[PDB]
Design an enzyme around this catalytic site. Structure first.
Site, mmCIF file in Angstrom:
data_model
loop_
_atom_site.group_PDB
_atom_site.id
_atom_site.type_symbol
_atom_site.label_atom_id
_atom_site.label_comp_id
_atom_site.label_asym_id
_atom_site.label_seq_id
_atom_site.Cartn_x
_atom_site.Cartn_y
_atom_site.Cartn_z
ATOM 1 N N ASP A 136 -58.098 -7.842 -47.806
ATOM 2 C CA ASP A 136 -59.519 -8.213 -47.846
ATOM 3 C C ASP A 136 -59.781 -9.449 -46.965
ATOM 4 O O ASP A 136 -59.410 -9.469 -45.795
ATOM 5 C CB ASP A 136 -59.970 -8.432 -49.305
ATOM 6 C CG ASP A 136 -61.476 -8.548 -49.447
ATOM 7 O OD1 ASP A 136 -62.168 -7.531 -49.226
ATOM 8 O OD2 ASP A 136 -61.963 -9.658 -49.793
ATOM 9 N N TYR A 186 -67.731 -15.675 -45.983
ATOM 10 C CA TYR A 186 -68.731 -14.758 -45.414
ATOM 11 C C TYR A 186 -69.831 -15.509 -44.666
ATOM 12 O O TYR A 186 -70.416 -14.998 -43.724
ATOM 13 C CB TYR A 186 -69.404 -13.931 -46.516
ATOM 14 C CG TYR A 186 -68.504 -13.004 -47.306
ATOM 15 C CD1 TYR A 186 -68.254 -11.700 -46.879
ATOM 16 C CD2 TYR A 186 -67.936 -13.420 -48.499
ATOM 17 C CE1 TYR A 186 -67.428 -10.832 -47.627
ATOM 18 C CE2 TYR A 186 -67.130 -12.564 -49.265
ATOM 19 C CZ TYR A 186 -66.877 -11.278 -48.827
ATOM 20 O OH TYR A 186 -66.066 -10.460 -49.590
ATOM 21 N N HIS A 230 -60.351 -0.021 -53.666
ATOM 22 C CA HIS A 230 -60.195 -1.246 -52.876
ATOM 23 C C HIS A 230 -58.936 -2.081 -53.181
ATOM 24 O O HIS A 230 -58.282 -2.580 -52.274
ATOM 25 C CB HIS A 230 -61.463 -2.130 -52.998
ATOM 26 C CG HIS A 230 -61.384 -3.409 -52.224
ATOM 27 N ND1 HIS A 230 -61.565 -3.469 -50.853
ATOM 28 C CD2 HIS A 230 -61.136 -4.681 -52.618
ATOM 29 C CE1 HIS A 230 -61.434 -4.714 -50.444
ATOM 30 N NE2 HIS A 230 -61.166 -5.473 -51.496
#
Length: 318
Positions: A101, A232, A297
């Site tokens: 990730d 992010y 995921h």
């Protein structure tokens, strides 16, 4: 678990919580969002018990690691800054890299800046974020999925934190951790709502214990979500600053593994990039691509044994 060692070190001006076990060549594990060093619990035990040095930090802003207040202290460069320092405390020139990730994106930046420090890379979930000169990372995402794409929603300071606070830390984590629904995560307007998962199970899947959930919830209830969200928030800044490496290629040996139901794989044109030849062109020594059937995921927790063995076999070639 109780033989895993947990120390605080001083790296790149911050205090970072490190988890370690085993002796041997170093395997460096990088978790993603919204996880901890803990997500690697099975990989740490397995690899240590086969003669490798397993090292899994809480990254900057996570868990028991220092969480700087400024959004701008969360560029990829700051994080790779932390890891270069840590690897130097480890006393080694080269490492074996395993990441997932956001940890994978940091892993990639590391292989870009200092390939010579990475023997070989086991990358889960997220492949290389190819730098398109013509469009910024999050600009391309918003153009593709609109403003309510989760990454676009994570951008504005304080807002996602409040929405997350409405539904509760435990809800948010259970919501993300139990998702099996593929495709771009798109939030409802103005709130968290059902977030990543409109189909939340009553009971946790069998790869995740009530204890596991609680350890996550125990850390995030103290740190909150800001530090992890701030990664992010630097995606466009990361894009601008990585101009020196535009059109470049990465020569580190790479083994890429993903769950079949991963949102990353089932969005952002990733299949076309992964299998189509674009990923191989960016990474000439991309070895296998392994897609794990019926796995979502969090593949290092959901399919722990396969991941363990996929790592060992890959790193043994070197």
């Amino acid at each position: 678990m109780e033989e895993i060692e947990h120390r605080t070190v001083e790296v790149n001006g911050i205090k970072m919580h490190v988890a370690e076990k085993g002796e041997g060549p170093v395997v460096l594990f990088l978790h993603g969002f919204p996880e901890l060093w803990y997500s690697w619990r099975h990989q740490i035990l397995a690899l240590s018990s086969r003669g490798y040095r397993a090292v899994a930090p809480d990254l900057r802003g996570y868990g028991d690691t220092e969480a700087p207040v400024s959004i701008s202290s969360y560029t990829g460069f700051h994080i790779v800054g932390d890891l270069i320092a840590l690897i130097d405390l480890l006393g080694v020139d080269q490492v074996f890299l395993v990441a997932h990730d956001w940890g994978a994106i940091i892993g990639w930046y590391l292989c870009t800046f200092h390939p010579d420090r990475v023997k070989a890379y086991v990358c889960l979930s997220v492949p290389l974020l190819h730098r398109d000169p013509n469009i910024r990372t999050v600009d391309a995402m918003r153009a593709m999925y609109g403003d309510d794409y989760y990454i676009c929603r994570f951008q504005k300071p304080g807002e996602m934190e409040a929405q997350m606070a409405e539904v509760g830390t435990e809800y948010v984590l259970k919501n993300i951790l139990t998702t099996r629904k593929p495709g771009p995560p798109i939030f409802p307007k103005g709130e968290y709502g059902t977030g990543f998962n409109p189909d939340m199970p009553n009971s946790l899947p069998s790869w995740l214990t009530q204890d596991d959930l609680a350890y996550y919830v125990s850390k995030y209830e103290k740190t909150g979500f800001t530090g992890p969200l701030n990664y992010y928030r630097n995606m466009n800044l990361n894009w601008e600053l990585t101009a020196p490496w535009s059109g470049g290629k990465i020569q580190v040996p790479v083994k890429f593994i993903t769950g079949e139901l991963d949102q990353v794989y089932t969005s952002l044109n990733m299949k076309e990039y992964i299998h189509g030849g674009g990923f191989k062109q960016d990474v000439p020594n991309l070895e296998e691509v392994i897609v794990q059937k019926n796995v979502a995921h969090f593949n290092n927790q959901e399919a722990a044994e396969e991941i363990n063995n996929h790592i060992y076999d890959f790193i043994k070639k070197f």
